[PDB]
Structure formats: C-alpha cells, structure tokens
Amino acid sequence: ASVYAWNRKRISNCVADYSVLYNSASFSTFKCYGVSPTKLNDLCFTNVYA
C-alpha cells in the first residue's frame, strides 16, 4: 500500500520465528526500538500490529 494509506494487519495467536528474518541480508534495514533485535523470540505479547 501507499505510505499515506498504510495497511494494518492484526496478528493474534500465531507462533513466529524472527530469527530467519533477522538473519536475512535481503532486508536492507532491520532496526528495533524498545526491544533488542537479537532477543526477540522470547518476548510474548497479546497482539501484534503490522
């Protein structure tokens, strides 16, 4: 979607593996704020917005 019409996806109840994405050179930018980018798989939250 366009940046002004940014799309939002809701993520409830699904396991995800942020290690295969952090280890990928395809992503030109991977920067995290408030949570360490390395320690990401351990964290648990009730909902995720994308």
Partner: peptide, 20 residues
C-alpha cells in the same frame, strides 16, 4: 473486526469466564 476464529439425548454445558 475479528480477533479469533476456530473451526473443529441429553447435553450439559458449563460456560464461565475466569481471569480472561
């Protein structure tokens, strides 16, 4: 707005809601 979706004489059921 959907936040969950699951798919799987006398009958008795007990419905309760405790600690979320």
């Amino acid at each position: 707005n959907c936040t969950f979706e699951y798919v799987s004489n006398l009958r008795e059921f007990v419905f309760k809601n405790i600690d979320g």
